[PDB]
């Protein structure tokens, strides 16, 4: 998780299986990891488990339920404004915990399990030390931003791009999570 | 699964090799001008830099290439032939102090291994240990810049 930050990916379902599970809403596959590669019939992104809750961006999850073994699970938290939604972490997952060291050197874990360095420039922004095409970042919405210890600093929200290259990324600080839970 | 680090052997010694940018690098003081084995026969080094202690053959099968560091952190981590990770404070562009010194036995056979930044990106290649009374408390390394340079 941290020291150093390494990560791997594993696909667990395909197109046809996903769809049935979307409708059915019942998912019996075994869960493992802090970040789940989430998908709707509309688009695919990421969900990150932090302190017992599985978060992701509202602009991807909407107010949908999450397919689980015991059927669909309604969202625990929903904040259109914070652009966050959260369901209790799937049984089997591992949660990250909020960063407590204020490090400005964040590491964005992408949908392809590539952890990349971003330097914090604002309360909700960091710049890529090595800009990349946005196609790379595509699908990594909801992914985590880790401080050098492997703790959640925020969730990837949008790419600050131009000409198709991404120079920075906007994120939702873990602070917004606490606010959102205290909110609704 | 694809391994980024290969554990290699020579008639006399065993060391490591690290795949970076499609090349499989190691220490010349281990490999020499040797060829790497392949199910199609011996492959030759694409790169030989006897001055920097660096050699590279094209990446073998079952390997994954590491990404060079672009954050320039000083908090490095060394992975040994036994898969142990060893924190290292980058003192210079080619040297670091183990945050906790270990007997050379523990670092033995790990030359060629990767020096990783907090993002697990290749900062350099482990070249040799720096020990006082048989206790490694520092290591020399070939920075990736050199590797990228030789390409």
């Amino acid at each position: 998780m941290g020291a150093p930050i390494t990560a791997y990916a594993q696909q667990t379902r395909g197109l046809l299986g996903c769809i049935i599970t979307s409708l059915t809403g019942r998912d019996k596959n075994q869960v493992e990891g802090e970040v789940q590669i989430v998908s709707t019939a509309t688009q695919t992104f990421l969900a990150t488990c932090i302190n017992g809750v599985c978060w992701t961006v509202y602009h991807g999850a909407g107010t949908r339920t999450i397919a689980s073994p015991k059927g669909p699970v309604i969202q625990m938290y929903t904040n259109v404004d914070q652009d966050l939604v959260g369901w209790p972490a799937p049984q089997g997952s591992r949660s990250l915990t909020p960063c407590t060291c204020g490090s400005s050197d964040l590491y964005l874990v992408t949908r392809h399990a590539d952890v990349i360095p971003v330097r914090r420039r604002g309360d909700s922004r960091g710049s890529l030390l090595s800009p990349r095409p946005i196609s790379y970042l595509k699908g990594s919405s909801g992914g985590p931003l880790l401080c050098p210890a492997g703790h959640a600093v925020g969730l990837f929200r949008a790419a600050v791009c131009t000409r198709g290259v991404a120079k920075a990324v906007d994120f939702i600080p873990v602070e917004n999570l606490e606010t959102t839970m205290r909110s609704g | 699964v694809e391994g980024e680090v290969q554990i290699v052997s020579t008639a006399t010694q065993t060391f490591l090799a690290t795949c970076i940018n499609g090349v499989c690098w190691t220490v010349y003081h281990g490999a020499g001008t040797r060829t790497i084995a392949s199910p199609k026969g011996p492959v030759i080094q694409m790169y030989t830099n006897v001055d920097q202690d660096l050699v590279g053959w094209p990446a073998p099968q079952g390997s994954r290439s590491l990404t060079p560091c672009t954050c320039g952190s000083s908090d490095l981590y060394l992975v040994t032939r036994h898969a142990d990770v060893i924190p290292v404070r980058r003192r210079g562009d080619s040297r670091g102090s183990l945050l906790s010194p270990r007997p050379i036995s523990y670092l033995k056979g790990s030359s060629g291994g990767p020096l990783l930044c907090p993002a697990g990106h290749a900062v350099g290649l482990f070249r040799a240990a720096v020990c006082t009374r048989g206790v490694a408390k520092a290591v020399d390394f070939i920075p990736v810049e050199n590797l990228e340079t030789t390409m």
Binding site: Q10 | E4, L16, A31, T35
Partner: peptide, 17 residues
């Protein structure tokens, strides 16, 4: 002939089979 032989491999991420 006298070559270098890969005798094992390490996956830095810990990825299992």
């Amino acid at each position: 002939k006298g070559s270098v032989v890969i005798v094992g491999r390490i996956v830095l991420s810990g990825k299992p089979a």
